[PDB]
Amino acid sequence: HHHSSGLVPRGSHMRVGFIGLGIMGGPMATHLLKAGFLAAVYNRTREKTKPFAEAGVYVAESPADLAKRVDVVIVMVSDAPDVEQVLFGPSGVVEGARPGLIVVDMSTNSPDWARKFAERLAQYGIEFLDAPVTGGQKGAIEGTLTIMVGGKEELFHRLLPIFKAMGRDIVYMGPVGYGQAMKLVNQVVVALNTVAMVEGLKLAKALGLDMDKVAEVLTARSGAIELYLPKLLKGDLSPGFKAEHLKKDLGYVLEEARKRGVKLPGAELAYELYRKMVEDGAGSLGIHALGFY
Ligand SMILES: NC(=O)c1ccc[n+]([C@@H]2O[C@H](COP(=O)([O-])OP(=O)(O)OC[C@H]3O[C@@H](n4cnc5c(N)ncnc54)[C@H](OP(=O)(O)O)[C@@H]3O)[C@@H](O)[C@H]2O)c1
Numbered sequence: 001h002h003h004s005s006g007l008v009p010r011g012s013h014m015r016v017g018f019i020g021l022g023i024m025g026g027p028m029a030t031h032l033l034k035a036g037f038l039a040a041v042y043n044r045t046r047e048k049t050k051p052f053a054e055a056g057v058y059v060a061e062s063p064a065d066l067a068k069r070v071d072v073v074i075v076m077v078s079d080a081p082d083v084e085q086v087l088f089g090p091s092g093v094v095e096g097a098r099p100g101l102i103v104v105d106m107s108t109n110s111p112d113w114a115r116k117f118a119e120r121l122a123q124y125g126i127e128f129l130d131a132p133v134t135g136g137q138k139g140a141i142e143g144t145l146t147i148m149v150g151g152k153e154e155l156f157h158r159l160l161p162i163f164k165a166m167g168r169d170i171v172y173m174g175p176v177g178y179g180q181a182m183k184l185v186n187q188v189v190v191a192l193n194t195v196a197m198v199e200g201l202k203l204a205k206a207l208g209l210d211m212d213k214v215a216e217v218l219t220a221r222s223g224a225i226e227l228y229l230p231k232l233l234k235g236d237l238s239p240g241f242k243a244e245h246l247k248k249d250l251g252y253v254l255e256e257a258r259k260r261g262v263k264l265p266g267a268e269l270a271y272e273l274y275r276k277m278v279e280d281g282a283g284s285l286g287i288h289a290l291g292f293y
Helices: 025-034 046-053 063-067 080-088 111-122 136-142 153-158 160-166 178-207 211-218 223-233 243-259 265-279
Strands: 016-019 038-042 072-075 102-105 127-130 145-150 167-174
Touching: 016 025, 016 063, 025 038, 025 046, 025 072, 025 136, 025 160, 038 046, 038 063, 063 072, 072 080, 080 111, 102 111, 111 127, 111 178, 111 243, 127 153, 127 178, 136 145, 136 223, 145 160, 145 178, 153 160, 160 167, 167 178, 178 211, 178 223, 178 243, 178 265, 211 223, 243 265
Parallel strands: 016 038, 016 072, 072 102, 102 127, 145 167
Antiparallel strands: 127 145
């Protein structure tokens, strides 16, 4: 069946449907709406779609119902199994998409997962990019994300106006999976920079240092410090970036390391620390709460 017009003209071939309105996906999709690309959203929990519906965005009943109405599906759900559900479940994207639709997975998983998604989608005539991001919740909100992309370079170029609505530095990394590859390098760094900050703070507190001055001196400076030290000092342990998601990222890091015969003892330790945090019931706190939960 064909369908009625929506927010974005069909002849643009740039109608976007966005799946996963979380800490990242809400602000990202809002930036796409402000830029005139957002036609539709889907979220597993319907309440989060409310602010979109109040701006006229179509609220889909399933990923399939979203896919049949758009040219580009952006996915920003938690983990690779969640991407599998939204793409390939009973009412997943593949049940609604027409050939030539592009899926862009902006969530974090792995090169191997990116390649599997692309392979499976190509059987339906659906294109794929892996385009994970860095910059945190604050970057999402500000529209300044760094976006690292794998897949056909021609599709990277075609979608650059969409990426520029959400981010600032848009980097083409190579074939399918090279965006996830970059993102997993990035997550090694983020994890250990976060452990750095937390251990520094634990030592500073034990020594009874003036936190104002600690923050001044450390702002040693890193991403984690700039994004999360103010929250941490106020005891705001909310994400931010959930500990369970970093655990997940570090699992893929260590799988890739093992596949390639590289030893990453720091990443192994980080994985252990974040694994304990999830076991202890703090998986939904931000990563900056490590050591403090
Ligand atoms: N937060 C950060 O700083 C940050 C930065 C860069 C990249 N990332 C990555 O971006 C991705 C999203 O992160 P986030 O911080 O936005 O996570 P989040 O706040 O936990 O949101 C997760 C989103 O995924 C949806 N979801 C999860 N499982 C699903 C399933 N099986 N089916 C359908 N929807 C599902 C959730 O739906 P509900 O609303 O129903 O729960 C929610 O919309 C993750 O891969 C994360 O690692 C995060």
